């Protein structure tokens, strides 16, 4: 660090608070600007937990902790690391959805880069305004599909911000090499347009070619300054655009879409663990999705990749997967439109045309059910009872977020199937004890289990493009960490409390895969992949800021 004096305290990246040693204070011009007390990160950590403990609401907790990131970055991450599982619901789903829908009312300081349609032709000048010179990862959103909350416009910047926090909290990626970005081309949200606190352009969404050009101009600007292999993760974009930009840029830049490919990998991993207990014959699998968008089509695709690799031909696999959206069951010749992606899973209408999702379950008699409609409690008791009636061990996945949009609760799933189901959810739920004394502990099927470790692998390997088989590998790498004991408790995923090592482990496996398939370019190739990864993780412990002073012989 080149700076000295107060500027060191004003920048959260460097500010150590009372943890600045006396030598540091005297040598860096800080003597007098801090109380005469020298503290440790541990004392600071104590102050935090003491304070947090006394707090009452989750949003209040969110504002308190997210604020530390703007005062003392090192301490911020230390605090998450102290107990990531307990803070996850505040910092991530579901409280993050609340913060977003409230972004303008709680505003204090901005975070990330903001690029609006009004800046077209001048995006490179905006990118050059970013203080950090070595960004490696970017998470960008246009805010049209924020969780299951829909179009929140610029209030959606909360997502990319929180997403990168996990980059560092889960996989040890350097915070100063991360860049959250929000593309503001307007919002179709009538209430936000009438909101005095709204933080974006007061106009409807510009869907013309101008939009595509702005995005294209954005990708170019980012890579022109930071490099062609700068990781770019697309997050919470609308259905149409999400698929379009993925197909358009995946072979050109180092990019992927979390909602489509990250979700694909976590779901598969949970489906794999489930099979470990059911061991059902492949010719018998029959999956039915509620919803048919980004997540649904992404999961369905990884599932087919797996079945195919487990025998079945691509076409046979697809026949095992069905979808039911807001218009009904996806069957050939239906009135409602069917896109190019849904096509493969759109099949000939069965004996009868289901009117409700309950009808579908009964007619189709699926073995697995996957909720990803973002429309609330659609896995009703009747649907849950039907699944348990049809199956001995039904697999029930309600992945919509935040919690309020989920398809059903863990308690609803376990109690209604007499503890026979294998359940997973997108948002957090605690253990379930039935009137009979049995206790079931459900796992969280959320892409946070996937993106952190995959991002670290790609960054470290100087990888240029991310293929789908890279997520298939991550799926396998995550599920191979589940122990029988945990599986026994009802967990289809490793404990959230250990998400740090689980990520690092996924990174190691993925970098082993990239190098093995000639997708890595970092040289020379490391002998010991695991030691290589573990060796380059960012730590929340303070570094010495003292200059190298030494005597000459």
Ligand X SMILES: NC(=O)c1ccc[n+]([C@@H]2O[C@H](COP(=O)([O-])OP(=O)(O)OC[C@H]3O[C@@H](n4cnc5c(N)ncnc54)[C@H](O)[C@@H]3O)[C@@H](O)[C@H]2O)c1
The annotation places the binding site for NAD(+) at 145, 239, 292, 294-295
**CA separation for the pair 411, 116 (Å, rounded):** 44
Binding mask 425-444 for ligand OXL (x = CB under 6 A): -x------------------
- Catalytic residue flag (residue 253): no
Judged by beta carbon distances under 5 to 8 A according to partner kind, the member of ligand X, ligand OXL, Mn ion, none in contact with residue 291 is: ligand X
Residue 241 interacting with ligand OXL (CB under 6 A): no
Q: Which of 62, 92, 226, 414 is labelled catalytic?
A: 92
Known binding positions for a divalent metal cation: 235-236, 259
For 158, counting Cβ atoms within 10 Å of its Cβ (0-12 exposed, 13-18 middle, 19+ buried), the class is buried
In the set 24, 184, 294, 412, which binds ligand X (CB under 6 A)? Answer: 294
Residues 91/66, Cβ–Cβ less than 8 Å:
yes
Residues 209-268 that bind a second copy (CB under 8 A): 228
Strand partners, 182: 114, 141
By C-beta, is 239 or 441 nearer to ligand X?
239
- Please pick, from the candidates 4, 49, 276, 531, the single residue that binds a second copy as defined by CB under 8 A: 4
For residue 402, the minimal CB distance to ligand OXL (Å) is: 7
> Measured between alpha carbons, how far is residue 203 from residues 32, 118, 223, 308 in Å?
50, 11, 29, 47
Rg, Å, the chain Cα set: 24
Q: Is 259 in the site for ligand OXL (CB under 6 A)?
A: yes
Give the shortest CB-222-to-a second copy separation in angstroms. 12
480 binds a second copy (CB under 8 A): no
For position 403 contacting ligand OXL by CB under 6 A, the verdict is no
Residue of the chain from 120, 365, 522, 534 that contacts ligand X (CB under 6 A):
522
Beta carbons within 10 angstroms of residue 268's beta carbon: 26
Asked if 473 interacts with ligand OXL (CB under 6 A), we say no
- According to DSSP H, which parts of 117-172 are helical? 123-127, 158-171
Which two three-digit tokens encode residue 546? Answer: 């003292």
Q: Which is nearer to ligand OXL, 72 or 447 (CB)?
A: 447
The residue from 401, 409, 463, 503 that contacts ligand OXL (CB under 6 A) is 401
* List 16, 19, 30, 463, residue binding a second copy (CB under 8 A): 30
Contact status, residue 483 vs residue 434, Cβ threshold 8 Å = no
Q: Binding to ligand OXL (CB under 6 A): which residues in 344-383?
A: none
What are the beta bridge partners of residue 233?
139, 256
Is residue 177 part of the contact set for ligand X (CB under 6 A)?
yes
- DSSP letters along 394-420, please? -EEEE--SSGGGSS--HHHHHHHTTT-
347-406 positions binding a second copy, by CB under 8 A: none
What does 22 interact with, of a second copy, ligand X, ligand OXL, none (CB < 5 to 8 A by kind)?
a second copy
| Neighbouring-strand partners of residue 256 | 233
Is 173 among the residues that bind ligand X (CB under 6 A)? yes
532 a catalytic residue:
no
Strand partners, 325: 328
Half-sphere exposure of 125 (CA within 13 A, CB side): 5
CA 449/CA 503 separation, integer angstroms: 7
Distances from the Cα of 371 to the Cα of 93, 326, 327, 388, 430, angstroms: 16, 12, 15, 16, 19
Q: Is 147 in the site for ligand OXL (CB under 6 A)?
A: yes
Annotated binding site: 47, 71, 145, 235-236, 239, 259, 292, 294-295, 401, 446
CA-nearest of 172, 184, 177, 176 to 211 is: 184
**Contact, 160 vs 141, CB < 8 A?**
yes
What is the contact surface with Mn ion in residues (CB under 5 A)? 235-236, 259
Q: Which residues bind ligand X (CB under 6 A)?
A: 133-134, 136, 145, 147-148, 172-174, 177, 224-227, 239, 259, 263, 266, 290-296, 325-326, 372-375, 378, 399-401, 405, 426, 445-447, 459-460, 462, 522, 536-538
Q: What are the catalytic residues?
A: 92, 163
Q: Which residues bind ligand OXL (CB under 6 A)?
A: 93, 147, 236, 258-259, 401, 426, 446-447
């Amino acid at each position: 660090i080149k700076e000295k004096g107060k500027p060191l305290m004003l920048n959260p990246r460097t500010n150590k608070g009372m943890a600045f040693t006396l030598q540091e204070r005297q040598m860096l011009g800080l003597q007098g600007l801090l109380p005469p007390k020298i503290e440790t990160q541990d004392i600071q950590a104590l102050r935090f937990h003491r304070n947090l403990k006394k707090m009452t609401s989750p949003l209040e907790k969110y504002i308190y902790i997210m604020g530390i990131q703007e005062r003392n970055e090192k301490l911020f991450y230390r605090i998450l690391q102290d107990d990531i599982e307990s803070l996850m619901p505040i910092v991530y789903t579901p409280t993050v959805g609340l913060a977003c829908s409230q972004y303008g009312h709680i505003f204090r300081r901005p975070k990330g880069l903001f690029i609006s349609i009004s800046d077209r032709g001048h995006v490179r000048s905006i990118v050059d305004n970013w203080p950090e010179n070595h960004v490696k990862a970017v998470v960008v959103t246009d805010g049209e599909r924020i969780l299951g909350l829909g179009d929140l416009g610029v209030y959606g910047m909360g997502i990319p911000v929180g997403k990168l926090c996990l980059y560092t909290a889960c996989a040890g990626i350097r915070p100063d090499r991360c860049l959250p970005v929000c593309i503001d081309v307007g919002t179709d949200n009538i209430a936000l347009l009438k909101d005095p606190f709204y933080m974006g352009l007061y106009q409807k969404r510009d869907r013309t070619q101008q939009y595509d050009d702005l995005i294209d101009e954005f990708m170019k600007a980012i890579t022109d300054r930071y490099g062609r292999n700068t990781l770019i993760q697309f997050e919470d974009f609308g259905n149409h655009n999400a698929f379009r930009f993925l197909r358009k840029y995946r072979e050109k830049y180092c990019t992927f879409n979390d909602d489509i490919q990250g979700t694909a990998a976590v779901a598969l991993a949970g489906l794999l663990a489930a099979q470990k207990v059911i061991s059902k014959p492949i010719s018998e699998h029959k999956i039915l999705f509620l919803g048919a968008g980004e997540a649904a089509l992404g999961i369905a695709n990884l599932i087919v990749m797996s079945m195919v690799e487990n025998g079945l031909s691509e076409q046979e696999a697809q026949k095992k997967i069905w979808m039911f959206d807001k218009y009904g069951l996806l069957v050939k010749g239906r009135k409602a439109k069917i896109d190019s992606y849904q096509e493969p899973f759109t099949h000939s209408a069965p004996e009868s045309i289901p009117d409700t999702f309950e009808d579908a379950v009964n007619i189709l008699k699926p073995s697995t059910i996957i909720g990803v409609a973002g429309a609330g409690r659609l896995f009703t008791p009747d649907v849950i009872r039907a699944m348990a009636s049809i199956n001995e061990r039904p697999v029930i996945f309600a992945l919509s977020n935040p919690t309020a949009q989920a398809e059903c609760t863990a308690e609803e799933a376990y109690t209604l199937t007499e503890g026979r189901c294998l359940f997973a959810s997108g948002s957090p739920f605690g253990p379930v004890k039935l009137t009979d004394g049995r206790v079931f502990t459900p796992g969280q099927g959320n892409n946070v289990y996937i993106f952190p470790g995959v991002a670290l692998a790609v960054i470290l390997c100087n990888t240029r493009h991310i293929s789908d088989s890279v997520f298939l590998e991550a799926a396998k790498a995550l599920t191979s960490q589940l122990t029988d004991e945990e599986l026994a408790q009802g967990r289809l995923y490793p404990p959230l409390a250990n998400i740090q090592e689980v990520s690092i482990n996924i990174a190691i496996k993925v970098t082993e895969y990239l190098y093995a398939n000639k997708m890595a370019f970092r040289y020379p190739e490391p002998e010991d992949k695991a030691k290589y990864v573990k060796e380059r993780t960012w730590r929340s412990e303070y570094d010495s800021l003292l200059p190298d002073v030494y005597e000459w012989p």
